[PDB]
Ligand binder design. Structure first.
Ligand SMILES: O=c1ccn([C@@H]2O[C@H](COP(=O)(O)OP(=O)(O)O)[C@@H](O)[C@H]2O)c(=O)[nH]1
Ligand SMILES: O=c1ccn([C@@H]2O[C@H](COP(=O)(O)OP(=O)(O)O)[C@@H](O)[C@H]2O)c(=O)[nH]1
Ligand SMILES: *[C@@H]1O[C@H](CO)[C@@H](O)[C@H](O)[C@H]1NC(=O)/C=C/CCl
Ligand SMILES: *[C@@H]1O[C@H](CO)[C@@H](O)[C@H](O)[C@H]1NC(=O)/C=C/CCl
Lengths: 12, 683, 683, 12
């Protein structure tokens, strides 16, 4: 999010 | 040696011959560069980098060496170094397609999607038959909802995969992305199998024996040893789903081992799994896959659980080694491994019906309700109850939540109950509305603190990420998000890449049926927004019917779903973690289960919740469900009340019950093997 | 309010009025956005970000709010977030110059200089009168030695600065960059004064009283309290220069306080200053400048030392607060602060001759030899002695260094002494040459390990960065760098931005006089290389006369200077740390001292070393010195032998003597103030 | 340097 980070699932 | 170059597949053999080529002729740039490229495939990054630099020393304008060096630098996480090398390769040869494509991927990784798009296009201009570049471009276009030539793209993707799979090459479509594209199940499965194959090949070169596995429970005083392996014990969706599970395992029957693939990120998520697991092992410290698999073996694991599949931070090399007798895919990866080394996929009837066992290379192992679980009850208990302000009565315009909400309510001269407490428009209610209109951070009413839901990171930054429960009363309102006070809010909070032209068309249809309504989407990423808005307008919908907000911190994101009336799930790939998020807020989700596991998770959630009237069999149904919930206001009230009460009474968010079922299934798997049977379907 | 917008300079006043504007009219995008911009100037980043988001909520296509939000994100170090905002601003308005310029600076920060150049050009196309963009472009062009329209650029830079300084605005040329451009000393000083002014203005808004300062040494049991303030106690040139100084201070007379502005980076540099300072205080934990200055005051500091000036990580706000009675610039910043709050600059006669006291706003405080110091003797003692292999005798073709070199030499059947040990071409010598030709990491001779100088990070990564002394014998050779066995090597190891067209012309002249010779430069950054090579060729010099190597790890960089014959210093801005590096290797440096402190440091080093024959009075001399050292081989041997012996016998690398002189000067400053005088020149 | 980082002096 603006201001930090939103970790999500994503490819290797 | 043109030979060594040819030993494609026999890695240590190629290595040994490039060495010999340099024994004959020391001053051989190409041999240094090739030797580096194979040392890099073996993971010897520092040695690789040294020989690339030797190659460049001999041939200062060796473009190809710089471009390969940049890849090595990128593996070492020297990202600027990588950029310098790619850029240098392109300066030397501005028609080097691979260098442009390498540069583009650096841009994609930093989320600069327009710059990535432009560089993948340059690569494609220079080399029109370039699969890795086309497929990566296709993923970028997906991420930003760029649907230019959409249908051709899909066919072009299917074809590349067909070409590749025939030719035995590892395909240019990543298995995790394969769910977004209209490939056959055989194609998807085969893409996954290929990636699983590359894991065997990387570990076969260490010529390890098989491990021999425990056959009784005796060495472990009668306890099943379960190992959970994950790069995401930390601030990650995986921990937001399962962080309570290790500590709820019955210590009389199970001994829990958590194998972290990532270093400690300092968050309470990592703290909790560290504290509550019987054993916690940081495999991020043990980079060699042989050693790490050895550790697993000598811990005596009976069931090893793969929480990654093909996601960031995976080390499926460890599963390829078979350090354990039963090996199951669990929750982090919404698809098949395709890999012979994984025995089971923990799933369910609704998600993976026995009809489609063929999508999967693994055996199906069913949890009785959904295989999905969420830590919402523990992370967000302040959302269990709420109150409203009345400015006749809406549940989702001005909301208050807080651990101490009840005592706040009790300090008020007048409150009515409908169960839902309502605050009437007195001084208190105006002081609240005023705080919000002004963008003020908080106020005190009767000694309690009343917080602006927009300002949580200023008040308590650990409460914002979900690492702590908030200790103030938080106010959430439709005007904080520009949402209309007097109309239906449909929401979807997923990354934009989940949307496709058909899905946006269905939503458009629904918004045209429901004139007094808006669709609430996120800037996920913001560069997707003018595309969606452009496509909506060409579908004949005014500017103001789609409202965007920024991505929020975890707690605000879950709290704000209370403001919506209905969530419209993405049928392409559903909300997974985000489906649990929306349901915890009491917001009904409309979904249309597809063919893939990823297209079916929300229907499984909703079945576990007991809301079968929310599951569509086709597009017409999905629209009709959604129009019905935005026009039949009494039926919306019923369905909302059903969601609000069943998030608690149903199994969905019940981590203890989930863990006990999980345990019952681990034992079924164990007993079926103890008695020398091989993996088969568990029901 | 168009008012609040106008309160330019009265920050809290503007704030209070934008608040009131939102008290009248809550739904006011522009007021949210302006309120955010001023909250950001006050360092309230989270609050700023909240109001930018409010502004965008009201006006979804407010380009200017997104572009300002991106700046805030960049201050919070959310770099990808920043990119998303700038890109979004440019999508909404592709003619928004500031947004393009903001994007360019994101590219410059990641070292993607060509992408930064292209975006600053777009900004300049859209808005031709844009000083910040032109000046930043000028710095990018500098970094990569892009000299297109060089002379116009310089005049264009001088003019912008003239315009700005008249108009009282803070200039678009950074004071640290101001030494590269042919500005007057009055201009340079005034640029610095402006930046110093902005520090007062940011701290004036906290309306603190003056601090009152100690006047005797009594509260401190007779000890002068010295505070060293730096963002660079860690892996930084500053620590590579002075990390021994705190622990060598006489504890009977001094009490040393180190104020770190950066968190702990995990390196032995930080460890050493932490362990050896009497007190170590992590101001990176105390972000408010008022509190941090308070701490300094209550420690009782008599002399506070500013090690940053206008460099990354500075907090000159603390010096603006005057927490101490004597405040001196020391070693990290090669120029004047221009700031009334700094009393002294610790310098010397050669660097800052009393003639030019006017360049400086501070009083000159002289160390007796050079104010420059280096921790080389402590970091790199393995370079104190060396041996050669003979393949008649060169000191700089095949070199060995090692703590245990002497005992290795003693294990050999035949070695001659010339003092310099020479190894003859036997099996041993061929085993060594073979290891290098093959790119092998190391071999064992007679039980000792013999390491390839190229592979230090594989053997001991702490030895490579200079955090540990190497524990093997390292071999360094000209063929590792493609340098010729049979010709003069001239080197310069500085970042390319230090070179200008006149300097490269002088080098070119020298290489044409000395046909049997090469200039050895670094890829610092690699994208500067084809420019230099292009300019060299237009000066009439073949491809092979300039050899590039990559930047090396700290220890390899210092060790490899032994392979050169002569270093050609950059007269624009000299080697500082890098001048000490080259001298420690025993390599003579030719220099031409200019007008600025930055143009004069190498001549001060060389004077301290006792090599006055290496200092040129003009360009003709510089060439003649350099040609002389590449052709008169006996005089090269003499000058090299003089450098090799005086790095030890002279004061240059003598940290204990340096610290004692420094102490003698601290006391001179103190006594001159104890007796109520105000700052004046110390000699 | 390629492989890690070489800290240098640079503007604030
Ligand atoms: O404004 C938001 C929207 C989403 N999320 C979180 O972002 C992640 C999205 O991850 P992913 O795309 O993998 O979710 P899934 O595919 O599981 O639904 C989830 O943890 C959400 O809880 C968030 O914190 N703030
Ligand atoms: O190949 C190299 C060349 C330089 N350096 C180091 O890089 C830094 C360059 O910093 P800066 O430009 O500030 O040096 P200065 O201006 O002081 O000479 C110095 O510490 C050098 O020791 C390095 O480690 N490897
Ligand atoms: C991301 O996050 C959760 C927990 O790790 C996992 O259950 C969920 O399946 C996953 N969502 C996706 O991977 C979407 C993929 C389409 Cl490329
Ligand atoms: C960088 O490093 C050392 C130690 O901090 C300092 O002494 C030296 O003066 C500095 N060099 C430069 O700042 C060059 C500037 C031209 Cl923009």
């Amino acid at each position: 999010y603006p201001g930090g980070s939103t970790p999500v699932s994503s490819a290797n | 040696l043109a030979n060594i170059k040819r030993e494609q597949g026999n890695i240590e053999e190629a290595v040994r011959l490039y060495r010999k080529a340099l024994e004959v002729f020391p001053e051989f740039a190409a041999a240094h560069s090739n030797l580096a490229s194979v040392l890099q495939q073996q993971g010897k990054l520092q040695e690789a980098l040294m020989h690339y630099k030797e190659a460049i020393r001999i041939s200062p304008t060796f473009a190809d060496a710089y471009s390969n060096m940049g890849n090595t630098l990128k593996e070492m996480q020297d990202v600027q170094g990588a950029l310098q090398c790619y850029t240098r390769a392109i300066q030397i040869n501005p028609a080097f397609a691979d260098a442009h494509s390498n540069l583009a991927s650096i841009h994609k990784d930093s989320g600069n999607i327009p710059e990535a798009i432009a560089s993948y296009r340059t690569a494609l201009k220079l080399k029109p038959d370039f699969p890795d570049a086309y497929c990566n471009l296709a993923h970028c276009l997906q991420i930003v909802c760029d649907w230019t030539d959409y249908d051709e793209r899909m066919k072009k993707l299917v074809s590349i995969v067909a070409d590749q799979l025939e030719k035995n090459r590892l395909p240019s479509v990543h298995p995790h992305h394969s769910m977004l594209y209209p490939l056959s199940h055989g194609f998807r499965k085969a893409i996954a199998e290929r990636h699983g194959n590359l894991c065997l090949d990387k570990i076969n070169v260490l010529h390890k024996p098989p491990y021999e596995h425990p056959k009784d429970l005796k060495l472990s005083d009668g306890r099943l040893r379960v190992g959970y392996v994950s790069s995401d014990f930390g601030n990650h969706p995986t921990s937001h789903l399962m962080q309570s599970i290790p500590g709820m395992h019955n210590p009389d029957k199970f001994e829990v081992f958590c194998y972290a693939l990532s270093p400690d990120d300092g968050t309470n998520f990592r703290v909790k799994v560290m504290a509550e697991a019987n054993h916690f092992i940081d495999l991020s410290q043990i980079p060699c896959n042989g050693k790490a698999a050895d550790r697993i073996h000598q811990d005596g694991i009976h069931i090893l659980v793969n929480m990654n599949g093909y996601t960031k931070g995976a080390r499926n090399e460890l599963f390829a080694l078979r350090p354990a007798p039963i090996q199951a895919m669990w929750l982090g990866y919404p698809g098949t491994s395709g890999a012979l080394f994984m025995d089971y996929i923990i799933t369910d009837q609704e998600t993976s019906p026995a009809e489609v066992a063929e999508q999967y290379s693994e055996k199906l192992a069913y949890m009785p309700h959904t295989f999905f679980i969420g830590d919402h009850a523990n992370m967000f208990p302040h959302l269990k109850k709420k109150a409203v302000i009345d400015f006749h009565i809406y549940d989702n315009r001005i909301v208050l939540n807080g651990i101490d909400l009840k005592a706040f309510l009790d300090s008020l001269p007048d409150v009515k109950i409908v169960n839902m407490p309502v605050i009437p428009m007195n001084t208190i209610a105006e002081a609240v509305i005023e705080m919000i209109n002004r963008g003020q951070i908080q106020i005190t009413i009767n000694g309690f603190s009343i917080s602006n839901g927009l300002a949580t990171t200023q008040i308590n930054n650990k409460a914002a990420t979900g690492e702590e429960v908030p200790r103030t009363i938080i106010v959430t309102t439709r005007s904080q998000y520009g949402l209309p006070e007097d109309a239906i809010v449909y929401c979807n909070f997923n990354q934009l890449y989940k949307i496709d032209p058909s899905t946006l068309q269905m939503w458009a249809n629904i918004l045209k049926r429901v004139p007094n309504s808006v669709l609430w989407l996120l800037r996920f990423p913001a560069v997707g927004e003018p595309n969606i808005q452009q496509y909506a307008q060409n579908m004949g919908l005014p500017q103001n019917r789609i409202i965007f907000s920024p991505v929020a911190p975890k707690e605000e994101h879950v709290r704000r779903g209370q403001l919506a009336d209905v969530c419209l799930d993405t049928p392409l790939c559903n909300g997974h973690t985000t489906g649990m998020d929306v349901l915890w807020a009491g917001t009904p989700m409309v979904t249309m289960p597809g063919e893939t596991l990823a297209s079916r998770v929300a229907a499984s959630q909703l079945t576990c919740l007991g809301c079968l009237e929310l599951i569509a069999k086709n597009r017409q149904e999905y629209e009709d469900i959604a129009v019905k919930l935005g026009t039949d206001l009494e039926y919306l009230k019923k369905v909302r009340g059903k969601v609000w009460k069943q998030r608690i009474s149903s199994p969905l968010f019940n981590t203890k019950q989930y863990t006990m079922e999980l345990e019952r299934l681990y034992l079924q798997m164990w007993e079926h093997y103890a008695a020398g049977n091989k993996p088969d379907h568990m029901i």
